[model samples]
Target chain A: MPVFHTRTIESILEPVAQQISHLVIMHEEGKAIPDLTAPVAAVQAAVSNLVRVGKETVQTTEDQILKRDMPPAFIKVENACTKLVQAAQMLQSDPYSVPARDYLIDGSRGILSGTSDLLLTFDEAEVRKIIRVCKGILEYLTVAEVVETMEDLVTYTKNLGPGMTKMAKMIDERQQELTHQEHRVMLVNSMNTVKELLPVLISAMKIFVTTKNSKNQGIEEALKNRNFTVEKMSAEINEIIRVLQLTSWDEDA
Target chain B: DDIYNKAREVINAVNPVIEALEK
Candidate 1:
C-alpha cells in the first residue's frame, strides 16, 4: 500500500483542532463556567507538536512514494496476477483440458510465489486494515445520531491505539525478512507519525466526552459546535481515506 | 456502537491475513 498524504494528515487532525478550539473558548468564558484552561493548554501544546511532526512525516512519505513510483508498479503486478487467477479458474472447469490445466496451474504457482515474495517486502496486511478502519470511521461518521456517532468515534480511536501497537510489533518482527528493511522502515515511520498524533486526538476526545456528559446549560452550544466540527472532520477523513486507499489500486486515479 | 463493532469485525476478518504475514 502507498503512504497517505498531507490532506489525509490534516483530516486526522480536524477533530482535535475543533475540540481544542472549543476548549480555548470555554477557557475565555471564565467565572460562570468550568475552568478548562489547564487541560486546554496541555492539549494545545500536544496538538502543536503533532501538527509539526505530522507535517514532516507526511512530506517524507509523499517524497518516498514519488521516488519509488510504487503504486503504479503494484497495480500492474496486481492486474497480471488477477488475470492469471482468472485463467487458472477457467482451466479448472475444463475436464478435457488436463494438459492445459497443468500449464495454468504451473503458471499460477510461479506467479503466486513471485507475488507473495514481493508482497513480503512490506506489511500489506497492516496497511489494508488501517485503510479499512479509516474508511469505517468515515462511513459511520455520516449517520444521523450525533451522540451515537461521537460515541463510536471514541471507541474507534481508542481501539486504533492498540492495533497500531500490534502493527509496530509486526514491523519489528518482520525485520528478519531480507527484502523488508526499507519497506519496513518506511511503514514504521508512517506508523510512528500516526502514533505521535493519536495522543492529541485522544485528549480532544476526552474533552468532548466530558462536555457531552455534563449537564451545564452553557456547554450545549459548545457541544453542538464540537459536533459540527466532528462531522466536518468525518467528511475530510473520508476523502483522505478514499485517496489513500486508491493509491494502492490506481495511481492515476 | 454498531460502527465500532463493524470496524472490529473487519479487523477480525483480517487477523488471519495479518498472522500469515509473519510466515
Candidate 2:
C-alpha cells in the first residue's frame, strides 16, 4: 500500500484552516462590538450558515469513509470535523472568548505536526514540481503558445510521466480498496470537490489579502462575509484532504 | 502570464514548506 506524506496534506490545508480561525475570531468580536457599518447581526447569519455547511460536509465525508471500513481515516477525519464543529459552536455560544480562535489555530497546526516526524515514503519534491508544472501550463498556455511551444511542452510534459506515475501509484494504492462502483463514485466525487473548490478558495483569499491590506471600511463588511464563506469552503477542502491521506487500500488496514 | 508565475511561486514556496513540515 502506498503511504502519503501527511505533511503534504497538511501543507495544502493549514492556511485554509488558519483563515477559518481568523474569521471565527472576527465573528466573535463583531458580536460584542457595535460596528454600525459592519453589523454584528449580519456577520452572525453568514457565519452561522457557513458553520452549518462545514458540519454537514464533514459528516457526509466521514460516513462514506467509515462505511468502507477504514477505521483510522474515519477517526482522523471525524476528529478534525468534530474540532471544526466545536470551534463553530464555541464561537456562537461564548462569543466573547478567544479560546475558540486559539483552539482552531492550534488544532489546525497540531493535526499535521504530530505526524511531522514521519519521513515521506516517496520522492515528494519531484511530485510537487511536476504538479506545479502541469498546473502552470494548464493555466497559462494559449492555443497559439500551444502550437509554438507544443514540441518543447510535449517533451516537458513527457518528463512528468515518471513523477506522475509515482503519484498515480500512490493514489491507486489507496483506491484499490474501492472495489464497488458506488464506492469509486463516492470517492471520486468527494475528491473532485476539493479540486473544484480550491481555485475558488484561492481567489477568495487573494481578494482577502488585497482588501485586508487596503484596510478600507466601506468594503469591510463585504470582506468579512467573503472570509466567512472562504473558511467554510476551506474546511470542506481540508476534510477531503484528510480523507485522502489516512484512508488506503492496504489489505492489512 | 504574471498570474501564472505568481501562482507558480506560491506553489513553489509552499512545496518546500511541505518538505520542511515533514520530519
Candidate 3:
C-alpha cells in the first residue's frame, strides 16, 4: 500500500477547517454572530500540530506507529518489497535516468505534481516498508504486478488526500481576492487548520486503510462523491478514540 | 518442515511491546 504521509495530513486538516466553517456558518445563518475571531483562533491552535510537528518531526521519527500488535506495521514490511520490484522493472526499461528525467521535467508538471509525497517519506523506516513490500510481492510475482499495484496505490493516495490539494489550491489560487477576503479567510483558515491537524488524521487514516481487510464501502464511496467531509473523518477519529479508551479488547477474545 | 512451522508459529505469536508511542 502507498502510505500517504503528506497528502493524508492534507486531507486530515481539511475537516478541521470545515468544522470551523460550519460553526461560523451556523452563527451567521441563525444568530447574526459576526464575531468568528475567538473560535477561529482556538481551532487554529488545535490544528497547528500538523504543519509544525508532523511535517517537521513525526514524518522523520524512527518508528511512528507505536503498537507492535497493530496490523499496519506488518503491512509496511510487505509493502516495501512491492516498491523494490517497481524500481527494478523501471531501471530495466531504461538503465539511465536521462530519458525519463527529461520527460518528467516537461510532461505535464501536474502529472507528478499531486502525488510526490505519498508513502515516500524522509523517514528511513517507511522507506524500508516500501522496499519490503516491493520485495515480498516481487518474489511471488513479476515486476508488472509491482508496477501495476504501485500505480493503483498512487491513485488511492491521491483519492485519500483529495481535500488537502483541492483546498490548498483553492486558497492559494485566489489569495488576492481582497474583496472576498472575509469569506476567503474562512476558506483559508479551514485550509490552514487542515494543514495543521492533518498529520494526526493521516495517522488515523493509515490505521483505517491498512488494518482493514477492505475499505468501508460507505466511506470510500462517500469520499468519491464528496472529496471533503468533516463528519465522515470525525467518525473515523471517534473509532480511534474508542480504541484508545479500551482497557483491553482481547481480554475477552 | 517441523522446524519451519515452529518458527512461523513463533513469528505469529509475536506480542505488542507497550510503549509511550501510543500517547
Candidate 4:
C-alpha cells in the first residue's frame, strides 16, 4: 500500500491529537493564573470528541485525508484544526476579552475600512507555543517526502501575515513583508479567477465553491431559489473571515 | 482559490467561530 494509503485516518488523528496536546499545554501554561492543572486532563477531554469521530467511522483514506488536509496549504489541516480548537478554548475561557484592534485606513475612492486590532498579549511561554506549532507544520512540509505538490506551498503562500511573517522569521527569511487581509482577499479573488475562468493557466486545481449541495442535486436549489442567500452569504462571509484570518492571527486563541 | 476553499472548509468546521464574527 502507498504510505499515503497505509496511513489511515488514525495516523492523521494521532498527529492532530499531538498538536492539540501542545496547544492545550500552551493554554494552561500560558494563562495568567494557569487555572487548570494537568494540561493533559484537558487533552483527554478534547480527544474524547476526536476519538468518538474516529471510532464511529471507518475513515477511508480519501475521506480522512481530504478532511484532515483542509487548507492554507502548509497546514496538515487537521493539525491546524487542533490549534484552532485550543485557541477557541482560550477564548471561550475568556470571552469578555478584546477581539481585535481598531483601525481606520483609506481605501480606493475615499472608502474607509474599519478593522479591530488582533493582538492577544501572551507571556513568553504562550508565544513560544505558537511558534512551536507553526514551526512543526513548516518543518513537516519541508522534510516530509510524501508531500511533493502544491499542498504546503498553497498554505505557506496564503498564510502570509503576522503569522506568515513569524513563519518567515522561523525559516530565516528576513525582510519579509507582513501580509494583511486585504492582500489575502486579493489573492483569493485572483486564484478564483485563475482556477474557474482561466483553466489553462491553473497551477494548482481542486474543488471549490459551487451552487451545488450534497448529492450534487441541489446546487440550483441553493443558488437559484435565493431562499438560502442568508445562508450562502453567511458562508461566503466566512470566505471573507479566513481571508481576514491570515491577518488576524494576532487575535486571541 | 485555495484559500477560498480552505476558508469555506474552515467555516464548516468552525461555524460557531464564524457565526460569532458575522457582525
Give each prediction's root-mean-square deviation over alpha carbons. 26.3, 24.7, 29.2, 23.8
Could you tell me how far off, in angstroms, the CA of residue A152 lies in candidate 3 after the best superposition? 6.9
Candidate 1 has a TM-score of: 0.30
- Candidate 3, residues A1-253, lDDT tens digits: the string is 3222223333433333333333234223311222223332322332232223333334444454422222332233223322322333444555454443222222212111111221123222333433333233223222111222334445544644554454345444433322334544544554465455555444434443443335444445433322233344334333322322231122225
lDDT of 4 by residue, A66-182 (tens): 234221222222333344344445554653333210000011001100000000111112233434545443343333222223664355335423443444343222111223335
CA shift at A155, candidate 2, in angstroms?
A: 29
DockQ of each: 0.04, 0.03, 0.01, 0.04
How would the docking of model 3 be graded? incorrect
For each candidate, give the TM-score of chain B: 0.59, 0.61, 0.58, 0.48
Off by over 4 Å in 4: A1-75, A98-253, B1-11
Task: Summarize candidate 2's per-residue lDDT along A89-172 as a digit string, tens digits.
Answer: 666655455565554444433333222211121123223333443343333322212221335435544543454344334444
lDDT of 3 by residue, B1-23 (tens): 22222222222211110010011
**lDDT (C-alpha, whole model) for all candidates:** 0.40, 0.38, 0.32, 0.30
Instruction: Give the TM-score of candidate 4 (chain A).
Output: 0.17
Better of 1 and 3 by lDDT: 1
Residue A124 lDDT in candidate 1: 39
Which model is ahead, 1 or 3, in terms of TM-score?
1
Q: CAPRI band of model 1?
A: incorrect
- Give the least accurate 10-residue stretch of model 2 chain A, judged by summed lDDT: A114-123
Report the TM-score for the A-chain of model 1: 0.31
Show model 1 residue runs off by greater than 4 Å. Answer: A1-127, A139-160, A163-213, A232-236, A250-253, B1-23
Q: Give candidate 3's total backbone clashes.
A: 22
